[PDB]
Amino acid sequence: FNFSQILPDPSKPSKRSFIEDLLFNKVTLADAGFIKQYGDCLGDIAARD
Amino acid sequence: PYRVVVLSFELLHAPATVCGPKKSTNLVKNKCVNFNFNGLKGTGVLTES
Numbered sequence: 001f002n003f004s005q006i007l008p009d010p011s012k013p014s015k016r017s018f019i020e021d022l023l024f025n026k027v028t029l030a031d032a033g034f035i036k037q038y039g040d041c042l043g044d045i046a047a048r049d
Numbered sequence: 050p051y052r053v054v055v056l057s058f059e060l061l062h063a064p065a066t067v068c069g070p071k072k073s074t075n076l077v078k079n080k081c082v083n084f085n086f087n088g089l090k091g092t093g094v095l096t097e098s
């Protein structure tokens with residue numbers, strides 16, 4: 001039996017394995033938003049999200 | 050001989066004619082301050098963009 005698809009791989013950021021890593025990029029719509037050190041929009045130099 | 054001038058101005062304020070803004074102040078930056086740039090009012094910090 002072959003389980004390398006679901007088993008975690010150390011040679012990768014975190015311990016995310018292939019299947020859930022592929023699933024993770026499927027959402028890519030909320031863009032997290034869990035205050036990733038917000039307040040950086042002190043000067044709205046970008047499109048201010 | 051005394052020189053005299055008579056001054057008369059109308060009212061009802063619909064044809065706004067003369068008025069006067071004056072009272073222009075200075076500018077500061079990177080500090081919390083109330084702003085009244087052109088009639089709009091608010092509080093915040095002023096920086097570049």
Ligand SMILES: *[C@@H]1O[C@H](CO)[C@@H](O[C@@H]2O[C@H](CO)[C@@H](O)[C@H](O)[C@H]2NC(C)=O)[C@H](O)[C@H]1NC(C)=O
Nearest residue numbers: 001002003004005006007008009017018019022
């Ligand atoms: C289990 O499945 C994986 C699929 O990822 C196999 O990995 C492939 O192995 C071949 C030759 O070993 C490589 O040419 C492929 O590039 C590998 N896949 C990927 C995505 O890189 C693995 O070989 C399988 N297990 C066994 C025992 O065959």
